[PDB]
């Protein structure tokens, strides 16, 4: 009559906040760039032919892109495709035999690199092998007659050469979920981050993300919606990393005009070491032709989003990174299997007033890397046969800011930070993991039998 019960439903639209594990998906197609599993696409399973996005009206779930447990899940993947394409190749501790290096065969005009030579073994055990290679003066360092050299890692790390088969080109991956868990997307335009987002949408597989080894800037990435995204966990804390995501790509023409010869050195049996073959003729260093028109275009767009952050009539400075390793001070990015650092001093320097050619950037090359600071496992990047032109969408930016100084009269800004969790976050800023609680209850007038 009027004595209420409880009634059980199954499949109610209900969810909570909980963190868990996803899985990779690169369609039934990305497998065909081959190059013996570029990066990570091998045993990973193809994607479903249609990622269903369902928009939600009248749904205000509180979001988080910073403590977001997926920004850290992403940072862990790049280490294991490394390890499971590292531990089964060529370990190179014999490469810590003293070297003899010299400014190369030129009319001087010094030389950045060295025409080196040193001692190794061959197919046979008793008999051994000397062979010459060419190293950047960054890759090597002196020791104490001429100046004698040795490799930079030998005072820190043993080394394992990678395999030239596995290409280090960042390969896109979708992030997908199973039953009981799913992914939210705050597709909204004017989205300020912290907390409730009025137009949530839900998906099974996120939009494809590229693991581009890119500090400061971001390349081959995700464009913004409407305005330019300007994020920072705490803008009043210059130790917090500040990250940019443009909606417009700046063009870059990175290349390395050198025909490289791969010397196949027997140091095994089996193990094949690659030495710098005689570089062909005229000598030019790696660079990137940046369209200055596209550069200053996105410059004026974001700068004007910033006077709204400080009074009404102000003075805004721009400078280069105040200091940091090559990943921090320069623009670091892989280019064909090798690694470039393009001296961002030729980008950050300006001041304008109240009323065809191309800039280009000088890039260095680094092969020996102890990246991921996994002291115990460093590596050598195999050499690349073929000039590496590389265009990509300049997508992001990582920077900080100065301190107190003289107030109001001005305040300055400069790039830095470096830490790749921001660059990874620029691809996951709009996502949040939840768990479904499909059981629902209510008191109706319904009774069963006894």
């Amino acid at each position, epitope marked *: 009559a009027e004595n209420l019960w409880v009634t059980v439903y199954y499949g109610v639209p209900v969810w909570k906040d909980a963190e868990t594990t996803l899985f990779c998906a690169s369609d039934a197609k990305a497998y065909e760039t081959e190059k013996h599993n570029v990066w990570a696409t091998h045993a990973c399973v193809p994607t479903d032919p249609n990622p269903q996005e369902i928009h939600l009206e009248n749904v205000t779930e509180e979001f988080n892109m*910073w*403590k977001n447990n997926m920004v*850290e899940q992403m940072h862990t993947d790049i280490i294991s495709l490394w390890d499971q394409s590292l531990k089964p190749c060529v370990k190179l501790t014999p490469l810590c035999v003293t070297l003899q290096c010299t400014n190369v065969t030129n009319n001087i005009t010094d030389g950045e690199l060295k025409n080196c030579s040193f001692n190794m073994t061959t197919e046979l055990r008793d008999k051994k092998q000397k062979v010459y290679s060419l190293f950047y003066r960054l890759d090597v360092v002196q020791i104490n007659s001429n100046k004698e050299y040795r490799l930079i890692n030998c*005072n*820190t*790390s043993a080394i394992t050469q990678a395999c030239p088969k596995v290409s280090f080109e960042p390969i896109p991956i979708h992030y997908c979920a199973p039953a009981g868990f799913a992914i939210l997307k705050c597709k909204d335009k004017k989205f300020n981050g912290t907390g409730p987002c009025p137009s949530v949408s839900t998906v099974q597989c996120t939009h494809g993300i590229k693991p581009v080894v890119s*500090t400061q800037l971001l390349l081959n990435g995700s464009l913004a919606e409407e305005e330019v995204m300007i994020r920072s*966990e*705490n803008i*009043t*804390n*210059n*130790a*917090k*990393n500040i990250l940019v995501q443009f909606n417009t790509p700046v063009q870059i023409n990175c290349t390395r005009p050198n025909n490289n010869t791969r010397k196949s050195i027997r140091i095994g049996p089996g193990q094949a070491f690659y030495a710098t073959g005689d570089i062909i003729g005229d000598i030019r260093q790696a660079h990137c032709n940046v369209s200055k028109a596209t550069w200053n275009e996105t410059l004026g767009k974001v700068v004007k989003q910033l006077r709204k952050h400080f009074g009404n009539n102000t003075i805004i400075r721009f400078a280069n*990174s*105040s*200091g*940091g*390793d090559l*990943e*921090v*001070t320069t623009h670091s990015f892989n280019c064909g299997g090798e690694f470039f650092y393009c001296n961002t001093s030729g980008l950050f320097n300006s001041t304008w007033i109240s009323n065809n050619d191309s800039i280009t950037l000088p890039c260095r090359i680094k092969q020996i890397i102890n990246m991921w*600071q996994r*002291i115990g496992q460093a590596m050598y990047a195999p050499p690349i046969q073929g000039v590496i032109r590389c265009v990509s969408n300049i997508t992001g930016l990582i920077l*900080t*800011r*100065d*301190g*107190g*100084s*003289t107030n109001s009269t001005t305040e*300055t800004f400069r790039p*830095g*930070g*470096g*830490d790749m*969790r921001d660059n990874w976050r620029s691809e996951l800023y709009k996502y949040k993991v939840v768990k479904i609680e499909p059981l629902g209850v209510a008191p109706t007038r319904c009774k069963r039998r006894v």
Partner: antibody
Amino acid sequence: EVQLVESGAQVKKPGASVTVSCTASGYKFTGYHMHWVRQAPGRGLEWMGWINPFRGAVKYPQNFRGRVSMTRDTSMEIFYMELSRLTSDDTAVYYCAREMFDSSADWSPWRGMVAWGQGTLVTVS
Amino acid sequence: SALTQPASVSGSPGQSITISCAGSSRDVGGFDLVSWYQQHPGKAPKLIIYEVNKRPSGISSRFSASKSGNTASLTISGLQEEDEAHYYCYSYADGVAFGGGTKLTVLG
């Protein structure tokens, strides 16, 4: 226990710059922000710069940027700094000191200097 | 400078002291990040208090600080010669606020 250990004493002339260091041990170097601050005897402490040892991010004030360059090493396990362009008004006891709340992912703040070096003296006359 | 410290302070052997740290609602009021220090004239310091009122394990229980809106404070009761030292403060401020040096003298 963990420590922050600095070098000895060095006396200089005007128009110079000084090597002053502060090594560390007892923990995993890579995750500890570090500052160089200078104290006048019985006065106060003035800030010149800080370092993120994860790839070397540094920052200074504006009476220092250009003068101060500042770095570290992550397997030799040591912090450096050299304020360049010395005058007779730049004498101080320089202290390395580590923050309270660092990590390897998120960040904050600027607080809490528990572990202190003994202080390295630099004189200019 | 970058932090409002007092010109000179004073206290007597056998009594007690306390110090005011005042600012705006943008620096102390909204950020639980205020730390305090004690250092003999020229000696190695050690953190007295952090996060408004927390000491490291090894610091005396005679120390304890506060945060009242835009006016924070540290209080010491029962002065011994353990406290014949110079005193400093610290506050949250964009990059970092740095004090100008409060000298401990005798008032009168």
